[PDB]
Amino acid sequence: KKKIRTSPTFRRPKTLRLRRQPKYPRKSAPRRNKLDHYAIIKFPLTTESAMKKIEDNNTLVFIVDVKANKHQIKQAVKKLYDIDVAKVNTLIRPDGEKKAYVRLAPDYDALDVANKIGII
Amino acid sequence: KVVNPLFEKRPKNFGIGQDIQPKRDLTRFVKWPRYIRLQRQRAILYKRLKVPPAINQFTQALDRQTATQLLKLAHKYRPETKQEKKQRLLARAEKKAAGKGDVPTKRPPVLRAGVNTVTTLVENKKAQLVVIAHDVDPIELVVFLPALCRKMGVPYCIIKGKARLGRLVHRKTCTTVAFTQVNSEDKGALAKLVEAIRTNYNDRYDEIRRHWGGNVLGPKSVARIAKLEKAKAKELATKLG
Amino acid sequence: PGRGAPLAKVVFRDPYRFKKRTELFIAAEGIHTGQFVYCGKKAQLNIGNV
RNA sequence: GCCCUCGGCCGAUCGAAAGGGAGUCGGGUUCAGAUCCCCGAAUCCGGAGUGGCGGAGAUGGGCGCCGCGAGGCGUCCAGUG
RNA sequence: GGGGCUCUCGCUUCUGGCGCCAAGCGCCCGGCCGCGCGCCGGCCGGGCGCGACCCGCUCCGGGGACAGUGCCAGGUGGGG
Ligand SMILES: [K+]
Ligand SMILES: [K+]
Ligand SMILES: [K+]
Ligand SMILES: [Mg+2]
Ligand SMILES: [Mg+2]
Ligand SMILES: [Mg+2]
Ligand SMILES: [Mg+2]
Ligand SMILES: [Mg+2]
Ligand SMILES: [Mg+2]
Numbered sequence: 063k064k065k066i067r068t069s070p071t072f073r074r075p076k077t078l079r080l081r082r083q084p085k086y087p088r089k090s091a092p093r094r095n096k097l098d099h100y101a102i103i104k105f106p107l108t109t110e111s112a113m114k115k116i117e118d119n120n121t122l123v124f125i126v127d128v129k130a131n132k133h134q135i136k137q138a139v140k141k142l143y144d145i146d147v148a149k150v151n152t153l154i155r156p157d158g159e160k161k162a163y164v165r166l167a168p169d170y171d172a173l174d175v176a177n178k179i180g181i182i
Numbered sequence: 183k184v185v186n187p188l189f190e191k192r193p194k195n196f197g198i199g200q201d202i203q204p205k206r207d208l209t210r211f212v213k214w215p216r217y218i219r220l221q222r223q224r225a226i227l228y229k230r231l232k233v234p235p236a237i238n239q240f241t242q243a244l245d246r247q248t249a250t251q252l253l254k255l256a257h258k259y260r261p262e263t264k265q266e267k268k269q270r271l272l273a274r275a276e277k278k279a280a281g282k283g284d285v286p287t288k289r290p291p292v293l294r295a296g297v298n299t300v301t302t303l304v305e306n307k308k309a310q311l312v313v314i315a316h317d318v319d320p321i322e323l324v325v326f327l328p329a330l331c332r333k334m335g336v337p338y339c340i341i342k343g344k345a346r347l348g349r350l351v352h353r354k355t356c357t358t359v360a361f362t363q364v365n366s367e368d369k370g371a372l373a374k375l376v377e378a379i380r381t382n383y384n385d386r387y388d389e390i391r392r393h394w395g396g397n398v399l400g401p402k403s404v405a406r407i408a409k410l411e412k413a414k415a416k417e418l419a420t421k422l423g
Numbered sequence: 424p425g426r427g428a429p430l431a432k433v434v435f436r437d438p439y440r441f442k443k444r445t446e447l448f449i450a451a452e453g454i455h456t457g458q459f460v461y462c463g464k465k466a467q468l469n470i471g472n473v
Numbered sequence: 474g475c476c477c478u479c480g481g482c483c484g485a486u487c488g489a490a491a492g493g494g495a496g497u498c499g500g501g502u503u504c505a506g507a508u509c510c511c512c513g514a515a516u517c518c519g520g521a522g523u524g525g526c527g528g529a530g531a532u533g534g535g536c537g538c539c540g541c542g543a544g545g546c547g548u549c550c551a552g553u554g
Numbered sequence: 555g556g557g558g559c560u561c562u563c564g565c566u567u568c569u570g571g572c573g574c575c576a577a578g579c580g581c582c583c584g585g586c587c588g589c590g591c592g593c594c595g596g597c598c599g600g601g602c603g604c605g606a607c608c609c610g611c612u613c614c615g616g617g618g619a620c621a622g623u624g625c626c627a628g629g630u631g632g633g634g
Contacts, residue, residue, distance in 0.1 A: 064602085068205035070212050070613080071481085078475085111503085118502090119511065151509075163510080192577040196606070198463075199566030202574060203439050204606050211613055219612095226611050400611055441574035457570035467567075479575090 099138035102130045106181045107161065120172040121165045122179075126152075128160045135162045143179065145170050231396045236325050238395030240316045243342045248378060252313065252341065255371050256350055256359065259293040263352050291363050295351040297323050300360040301330065309336045311361035311376055315344035318357050327358065332387045337380040431471075433460055448473075 104125045106112070112123035126135055132150040139147055146167040154160050166172050176182055194201040214222075233241075244252065262270065277285060294300060294309075303309040304327070312331050318324050331338035341347070347356035364372050383390070399407075431450035434443055454460070454471040462473035 066207055067209045067212055068207070070208045072212055072214055072218075111505095114503085115510085121510085153509095165510095190577080191579090193605085194573095194576070195565060197565045198438070199436075200573090202437070202441060204576085206606060208613095210610090213613070223612070229611070398611095402610090402612080436573080459567070459570085461567065465564090465566095469567090 097127060097129060097134070099142055102127050102134055102138035103142070104159075106176075106179065108181050115163060116172045116176050119163075119165060120168075120170075121163050122172055122176065124162045124164060126160050126162045128154065128158070130160070132162075135164065139164050143175065145175055226400075229396055229398050230400075233395030233397075235391055235393050235395070236329075237321060238393060239328055239390050240314070240318075240321070240324075240340055241395060242382075242390070243316045243340045244379075248339075248375070249341050251371075252339070252375055253346065253350065255368060255375065256293055256313070256361075258368060259291060259361075259364070261292055261295065261351050291365060293350065294360040294362055295347075295353075295356050295358070297327075297357045300358045301327065303360050303362065304330055304334050304336050307334055307336070308362060309360040310364065310372065311379065312336055312338040312358060313347065313360070314338060314340050314358045315347050315356070316340050316342050317344055323357055328383070328387070328390070332384055335384075337376045337384055339379040339383055435462075 104127065107123040107125055109123075115121040115123050122139070124135070124139070126138075130138070132152055135150050135152070136147055139145065139150075146169070148165045148167050150165070151163040152160060166175065196203055243249075274285070294303060300309065300312060304312060309331075312327065314324050314327055328338055328340075344355045344357060347359050348354050350356060350359060361372065429450040431448040431454060433446045433448050435446060437444050448460075448471075451471050458471065460471040460473070461467070461469070466472045
């Protein structure tokens with residue numbers, strides 16, 4: 063006495079949808095991250111402009127993987143050089159490589175970091 | 183006496199152009215899915231169209247009383263399922279080993295199911311009572327059975343529900359079931375069923391052959407026709423006498 | 424545009440839900456904005472009524 | 474998680490570096506880059522569960538009393554400017 | 555009085571307003587103290603029905619064994 067239809071439209075009733083519970087993983091193991099931080103940072107630039115950035119703007123110039131973004135470049139430089147960076151500016155060179163201008167934090171100096179990196 | 187004076191009725195009238203209509207039932211006016219429309223229009227078509235008696239005979243099914251006593255008798259002769267057949271076989275194997283061996287033990291009467299199994303029993307005169315479902319959806323598997331049962335002389339009845347016959351044989355659907363020989367304490371009950379079945383189906387098979395179905399118009403068509411029949415009869419009556 | 428006949432925008436009340444229905448009637452000559460037009464079997468003979 | 478209730482962009486999607494579309498400007502700097510770098514002033518959007526600080530809401534009247542008065546206690550009534 | 559009997563078996567027209575997510579009534583189901591004798595004192599919540607009549611086989615209306623479609627037959631056919 064209560065099954066009522068106040069609408070002249072029939073809609074498909076909502077039926078529950080089960081979450082996948084596979085009996086075997088399709089791939090046996092997850093593939094390791096190929097874009098690790100050693101892959102992100104390839105080599106630093108040592109041109110005259112790169113040297114000018116180090117002792118003017120406290121900035122390290124790097125050649126990075128083209129698929130790495132600013133967040134990934136920021137983390138990569140932080141762990142394998144133990145420095146803190148302020149911001150990362152990124153461009154893709156006409157030759158196809160990606161170049162990152164990594165400005166260090168004020169408490170870090172880009173000159174001694176470049177000295178211990180080995181790109182003086 | 184203590185009723186708060188602020189309470190009062192606020193009736194809303196649902197006349198045309200006034201307060202919006204209430205959420206009333208619209209089931210009759212629903213845009214239904216095509217599968218619902220198809221099966222409802224199929225039912226109406228069977229009512230409109232001339233239904234040949236060979237197809238219309240299945241509309242005449244057993245009454246609720248007689249169906250109950252028939253299924254009640256048929257429940258005493260259900261085919262055994264997979265579980266107790268194993269128990270029967272395991273008991274037979276151990277009894278065979280120690281030490282009777284064969285021990286036929288008078289294989290009990292059982293209900294025979296399936297249209298192919300039953301039709302061979304009817305042709306062989308070995309069926310005592312045939313029960314046919316009324317809603318065999320591909321209605322060619324059983325259109326011949328009522329005539330075949332009549333000629334062979336075996337009493338036959340039509341029951342509502344192939345699912346009920348299916349539940350009788352532990353399956354989803356059974357088209358027909360047949361009564362082979364029956365136990366002595368059930369012979370009287372089977373006899374009470376046969377003569378009533380035989381009066382309603384075998385004895386009046388001649389006018390079952392000629393009883394067409396359908397050919398009934400829709401209520402709107404009937405009502406307006408009846409309105410016209412009443413429309414002039416209200417002055418023909420004044421005309422006469 | 425492309426029609427040499429003015430169109431009248433007429434707003435009705437939806438009889439079944441709380442909403443306003445907007446129609447695009449072809450304007451009969453003499454009807455003006457702010458006029459009430461009445462549509463139905465029981466509407467009376469006036470310019471614009473349906 | 475399920476149930477009840479409510480729920481028509483009534484049509485996926487694509488389609489503009491001149492249409493719509495929030496919010497960056499001034500100065501300096503290179504051999505070649507800048508409204509993007511540096512310096513200095515802003516600004517938009519998004520986020521803050523444990524709530525970051527303030528301010529608003531919001532903090533007044535009535536009656537019994539104490540108290541010279543001012544000011545205090547109890548109760549009742551307000552209070553989405 | 556009034557029934558076979560007819561229209562109604564109706565709630566909207568002077569205004570460039572507003573109008574939904576039920577008031578009301580009835581029947582109940584929980585918790586509270588408690589007359590402490592049960593339909594029984596009163597307080598917080600929840601449900602159903604009438605409000606919003608019943609029944610029914612095509613959503614409503616217009617055509618309709620025609621139109622139309624398939625195959626063949628005759629005519630027309632520098633449009634090709
Ligand atoms: K654009
Ligand atoms: K031709
Ligand atoms: K031609
Ligand atoms: Mg799967
Ligand atoms: Mg860029
Ligand atoms: Mg929709
Ligand atoms: Mg696009
Ligand atoms: Mg230039
Ligand atoms: Mg030619």
